[PDB]
């Protein structure tokens, strides 16, 4: 029987990429990936 488990995680985590910031349509040879990384990691409750 279908039984699920959901330990409470807010929607702000597990971020998907939509519209812009696709990391594919974005220019290589001029974009640094660090900016997204720093922003994504902002939601982590503790050091990573």
């Amino acid at each position: 029987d279908p039984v699920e488990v959901d330990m409470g995680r807010s929607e702000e985590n597990n971020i998907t990429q939509s519209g812009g910031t696709e990391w594919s349509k974005r220019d290589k040879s001029t974009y640094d990936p660090t900016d997204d990384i720093e922003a994504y990691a902002l939601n982590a409750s503790g050091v990573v």
């Binding site: 640094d32 660090t34 900016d35 990384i37 720093e38 922003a39 990691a41 902002l42 982590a44 503790g46 050091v47 990573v48």
Partner: protein, 49 residues
């Protein structure tokens, strides 16, 4: 002798090509700086000099 950057502002300031070049020149400057990912979790983080 100290500058406080909000993370978006620091990302904007780091995006420039020339400010990266101030670190890579052999004799241009003496700017030790960690322009990569560092200290993601904590609040205050020191980025070189």
């Amino acid at each position: 002798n100290i500058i406080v950057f909000d993370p978006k502002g620091w990302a904007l300031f780091r995006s420039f090509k020339a400010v990266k070049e101030k670190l890579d020149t052999r004799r241009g400057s003496n700017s030790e700086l960690e322009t990569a990912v560092k200290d993601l979790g904590k609040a205050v983080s020191y980025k070189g000099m």
